[PDB]
Design an enzyme around this catalytic site. Structure first.
Site, mmCIF file in Angstrom:
data_model
loop_
_atom_site.group_PDB
_atom_site.id
_atom_site.type_symbol
_atom_site.label_atom_id
_atom_site.label_comp_id
_atom_site.label_asym_id
_atom_site.label_seq_id
_atom_site.Cartn_x
_atom_site.Cartn_y
_atom_site.Cartn_z
ATOM 1 N N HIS C 97 0.897 -1.162 0.000
ATOM 2 C CA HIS C 97 0.000 0.000 0.000
ATOM 3 C C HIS C 97 0.924 1.197 0.000
ATOM 4 C CE1 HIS C 97 -3.958 -1.681 0.653
ATOM 5 N NE2 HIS C 97 -3.639 -2.240 1.809
ATOM 6 N N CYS C 139 -0.176 2.506 -4.531
ATOM 7 C CA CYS C 139 -0.771 3.794 -4.918
ATOM 8 C C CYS C 139 0.213 4.919 -4.644
ATOM 9 C CB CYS C 139 -2.037 4.078 -4.122
ATOM 10 S SG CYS C 139 -3.313 2.865 -4.396
#
Lengths: 248, 4, 247, 4
Positions: C97, C139
């Site tokens: 992440h 991301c």
């Protein structure tokens, strides 16, 4: 939503439109900011880039020393034009910089401002076409002392198809010679003159990096810390196809 | 040689 | 400073003929001790997939699952201190992440730059003049791309020779399918598999971008704003020579 | 489909 400029799975961008496209050069030599010295030599870069891009078919426009609002205005108007008959768009900026920052004549702006208005949703007529950005400016004040080696319809992302080439790595100084122009622009113009018509853009910028990395080294005997320094460009690509200019 |  | 010259001054290709291809370390993050972060189901497919193709390319692969930030940093520094003299290159991939300027370890976050910081030529001479590759699946923010429909002897800079490939553009979400894996990794694996031996890396990554840009689109009927979204990777190159794996 |  937008016109398809080339078939879905083509390995190459379609560079066979009526026009190559616009090439905008924002050349900055002098500043109304007291701490910024003049960029003697940038006119050599500007002339040189303008000349080679014309031979490649670009309709070149050089904007000398604009204020930030002026650059922003011309950028928007460019993003507002109809690019249907152009293969691509090229924007170049020759100026002073810091990390995340470029200087206009009067004040600074974020580099992202240069390509912001050209995403496919904001500029549909360049959708599916290459949008090129070249930046000669420092991205900080770090130095690279170098090291010696011995012995029917398809959908695309609105952020696709951008190529953003910085003369240097984030955080680092960028070098300019007052009589020959910047290292990056000297190497870029030379590679474009030699194989600009036949070599794909990424391969071409790879050799531009080699040239900058190998054939240049700073000479500043008056300031040891700035002396014998090296530099390598930073090429950022979102290109979804290969780019070979061809000949109009 | 100068910096930008 | 001085390092062994691995290829000649003007060679257009990196020297990929060393006794060994090199190391490939994959930091795979499926689960987190940070409350706000959900499990990354499907990352294991990415990790197995990447490991398989790289092995066929000759890399000595090491998968590091769910390490803490300091354990990643330590291993990275360990790698940086190894002797890479008989290696063609080095490859580091991270699946986790992230947010703009940020990647998560199991326990906390760190700056992506920490991944390549220790390998500049001055800090790792045995990789001097050799390509250092980084692949990051995460991301770079939370913005969305709704897409559009097309219709109808010699000195070198110590920061040179790095290739940093992010699955997505700064500021943007990166997509992963819980069963098939992340879009970037599936396209990258498929492409490495199909032509890893023959295409130079930037040509190959261009097609990885093309696959990601053309063959994937989010399917999220429960959330209109997250539905039918698009993605393009962001390839950052400081490469001074072409890189063809061959062998 | 999920985001990272």
């Amino acid at each position: 939503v937008a016109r398809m400029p080339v078939d879905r799975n083509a390995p190459y961008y379609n560079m066979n439109h009526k026009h190559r496209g616009m090439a905008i050069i924002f050349n900055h030599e002098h500043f109304d900011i007291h701490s910024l010295k003049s960029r003697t030599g940038t006119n050599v870069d500007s002339d040189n880039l303008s000349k080679v891009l014309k031979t490649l078919g670009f309709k070149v426009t050089v904007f000398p020393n604009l204020k930030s609002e002026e650059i922003n205005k011309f950028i928007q108007q460019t993003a507002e034009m109809d690019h249907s008959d152009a293969d691509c768009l090229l924007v170049a900026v020759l100026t002073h910089g810091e990390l995340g920052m470029l200087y206009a004549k009067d004040t600074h702006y974020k580099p992202d401002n240069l390509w912001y208005y050209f995403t496919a949703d904001k500029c549909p007529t360049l959708a599916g076409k290459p949008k090129l950005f070249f930046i000669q400016a420092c991205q900080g004040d770090r130095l690279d002392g170098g090291i010696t080696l011995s012995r029917t319809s398809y959908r695309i992302p609105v952020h696709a198809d951008f190529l953003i080439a910085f003369s240097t790595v984030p955080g680092y100084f960028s070098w300019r010679n007052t009589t020959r122009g910047s290292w990056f622009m000297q190497a870029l113009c030379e590679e474009l003159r030699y194989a600009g018509t036949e070599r794909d853009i990424l391969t071409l910028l790879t050799f531009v990096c080699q040239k900058v990395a190998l054939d240049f080294e700073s000479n500043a005997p008056d300031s040891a810390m700035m002396h014998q320094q090296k530099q390598v460009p930073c090429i950022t690509s979102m290109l979804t196809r290969l780019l070979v200019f061809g000949k109009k | 040689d100068e910096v930008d």
